[PDB]
Amino acid sequence: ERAAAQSSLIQSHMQSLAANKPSRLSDEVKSMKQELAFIENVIAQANKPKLVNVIRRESGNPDLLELLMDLNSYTLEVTEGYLKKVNVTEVNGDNVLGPIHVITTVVSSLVRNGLLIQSSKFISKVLLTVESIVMSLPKDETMLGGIFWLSNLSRLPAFAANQKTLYEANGGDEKDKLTLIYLNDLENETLKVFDKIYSTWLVKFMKHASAHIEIFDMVLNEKLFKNSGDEKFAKLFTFLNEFDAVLSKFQVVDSMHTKIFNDTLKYLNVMLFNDLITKSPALNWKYGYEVDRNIERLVSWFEPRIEDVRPNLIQIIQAVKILQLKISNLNEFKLLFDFWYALNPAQIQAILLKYKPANKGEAGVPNEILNYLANVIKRENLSLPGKMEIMLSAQFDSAKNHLRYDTSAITQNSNTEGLATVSKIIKL
């Protein structure tokens, strides 16, 4: 109870320093999300972790506990024996989730017999080797090559948090805490390894495929008004369906198949925005409308499959709305600033500079305005970390709640090899 006095202290500070300009809405909301996150951290107010093995016993034949106790071999077979070897462009499709099935079983009964300092090993050695294979794949076998290993990996942290439900409600000081903690543990060093591999795979995947499609030319180009982009858009779609296929030809989790499509957009969002203040070339209220409408078709293919699509492309669908309303009153602008909530003043100063009206020295951007920005620009800059950034980077959230277990289908598309196969027999 004593500690109910440390909170009230460090706090008596965050309010005097809490309650220098009439900052706008966008600024206030952040201000808030911060006081809130803070206050919470203050409500949950560590020293020496250690790896430990536990006693055997239960469903552990005199041969079972024997195979386990020989890590050196189940691995190599998993690793170099078949996993590394597997040609994705050619897996019966019968067993698709093979690798995951396999990888689990081992981890499964390895844990059953409390030989953790034996599994941690296995799994850690496995992760490094999957990652590898991904960071290898050909510029082609980069499509159904990625996916295949990802949905397989997306299941690991899940069939980890599930392998938790098991040893929980018990209450034993050894085969519970040390364990509940190695599994609650695994969930993490797996989730990391999955996301990180996914983010570097997706990114890479989009680069290569964005050229196959040549998306720029169809949605951020003047040269193309023609229903010819409707002809190339056709290819785009002909391509997305293909991509859709894959995910399914490879039992990709459901709320995953989804994150993927949002992410897909996100990258395109960045890339589409980035080039919008690079190639582009000259911006014009009309040019906006062309590109806004082009963006319509692009989103058109997702309307049906996922929910709330346009929030991913906010950075550009917004960006474009701007161009679409050339402003000349500093006041108007000043009043409508609260509008564009996705771009920081910095990028606006970008979109807006690269603007000249082909209207013929007619619809020219004010100087009064361009100023307001440069100013706002400077103010913010010192006010927080050191220059806001213009170019848009591309990154995706975690897959924490979008991964999923389901022993069901796993087995429904899983067969086997050598050493493991016999390791499953002797299990139960």
Binding site: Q11, S12, M32, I39, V42, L335, L336
Partner: protein, 113 residues
């Protein structure tokens, strides 16, 4: 008397010969004119037709400065009805924001006591 009243006969016939020929020459020139008054009486109906069409080409391009210059006048209004109507929204939030803060102010008080 039959040689002189014969002369007067030879004179008249000869004169009637001339007098009837310049009558020929005349009506032959009145014919050609009737032709140019009939040709440049057509060109007066050719222009009177291109005119009545530039009469309908102007009634159209005039029933436009009306329609057009009006839907554009209308717009102005509606574009300003949106702007003014924003003042009203920035507030809704500014105040909605302040309301959310009291919920935090009062809360931060519950912690320092």
């Amino acid at each position: 008397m039959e040689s002189k009243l014969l002369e007067n006969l030879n004179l008249l016939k000869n004169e009637n010969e001339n007098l009837n020929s310049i009558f020929e020459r005349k009506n032959k020139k009145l014919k050609e004119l009737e032709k140019d008054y009939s040709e440049l009486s057509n060109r007066y109906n050719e222009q009177k037709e291109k005119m009545d069409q530039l009469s309908k080409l102007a009634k159209n391009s005039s029933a436009i400065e009306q329609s057009c210059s009006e839907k554009l006048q209308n717009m102005e209004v509606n574009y300003n009805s949106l702007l003014e109507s924003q003042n009203l929204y920035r507030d809704h939030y500014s105040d909605e924001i302040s309301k959310l803060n009291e919920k935090i102010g009062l809360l931060e008080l519950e912690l320092s006591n």
